[PDB]
Amino acid sequence: EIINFEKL
Amino acid sequence: MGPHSLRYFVTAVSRPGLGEPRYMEVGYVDDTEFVRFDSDAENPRYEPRARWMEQEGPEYWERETQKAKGNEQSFRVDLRTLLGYYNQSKGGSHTIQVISGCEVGSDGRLLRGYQQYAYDGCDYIALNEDLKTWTAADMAALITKHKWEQAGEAERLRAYLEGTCVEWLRRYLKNGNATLLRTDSPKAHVTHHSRPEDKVTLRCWALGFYPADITLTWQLNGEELIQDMELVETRPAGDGTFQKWASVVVPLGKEQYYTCHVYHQGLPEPLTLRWEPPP
């Protein structure tokens, strides 16, 4: 299960 | 079962004027792909392989599809953000890639965590070994660094790494553990090829092996020929298995003085072969 990515 | 890894490979590629960015999430267990999201479809969804499907249920993959589309759109913004950071024209194609995941030891405990970013194929920013601080690669990534340092992004990742990531990995095995079941020993043979004059080439082949890691060596009466040896990068056969070869140029008539050695985790012990001419 992949993480939720956060804005760069 | 020794150390194990869960890793996601993420690609976001803009193509201005030619459509929306192409987004992909690819999940690997022990370097075996087990799931893939590809945004390049009318109604795109997570495509788990048979095992993870229905050994997890439809609801779950539905929710991961929705999380994938969420990530997709967040990355869309990021591509625009990075144009600004680097003062790049809006008309060119650019890529962002992530490797994200964890590795556990045989005790089930987290060994290593992965959260690393690249822009146009160069390192951008990465979570350090300490799982607390970040390595920015350049001035643009310092902007991302400061921002994440403020929001406590590192702590957000430790929780995922030590919680969700690690637990998924523990769940996979027991249940399965299919990389030793997927272990295939190389089958080796030596071929013989003519060079100019009084030299010949002996080529040691390893075929049909998995996983990809392998070693081939040539020995002249004990003592690896640590040079003069040619080889190719290990390469896929396309049926799941891999191939490699190593060759040496030896004198004509002296082929029986050379031995090929093949080391692969699938083998009861290293293979040892010579050129066998038919009679």
Binding site: - | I99, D120, P236, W245
Partner: protein, 99 residues
């Protein structure tokens, strides 16, 4: 930056004349991911070439496996031709059945 593709062309199984086999063209070490790959039989594009999904490795470089069905003969010449932004001109690599 931009990385320059490396190419290998080789059969799935040891080739023997007359026996259906598969011809691979394995392209690695390239970036950006847009790449144009074709396989050629005796100078002419083979129309039915199947592509793997594209992946990338730890160093960020992409890779992909093109392949096509073939039955080797003593004389037919195969090649794989790759067009990619890192290269002024298309790189071509010939199948050598000893490699």
């Amino acid at each position: 930056i931009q990385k320059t593709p490396q190419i290998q062309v080789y059969s799935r199984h040891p080739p023997e004349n007359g026996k259906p086999n598969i011809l691979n063209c394995y392209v690695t070490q390239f970036h950006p991911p847009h790449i144009e790959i074709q396989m050629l039989k005796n100078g002419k594009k083979i129309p039915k070439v199947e592509m793997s999904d594209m992946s990338f490795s730890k160093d960020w470089s992409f890779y992909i496996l093109a392949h096509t069905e073939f039955t080797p003969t003593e004389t037919d010449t195969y090649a794989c031709r790759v067009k990619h932004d890192s290269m002024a001109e298309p790189k071509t690599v010939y199948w050598d059945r000893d490699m």
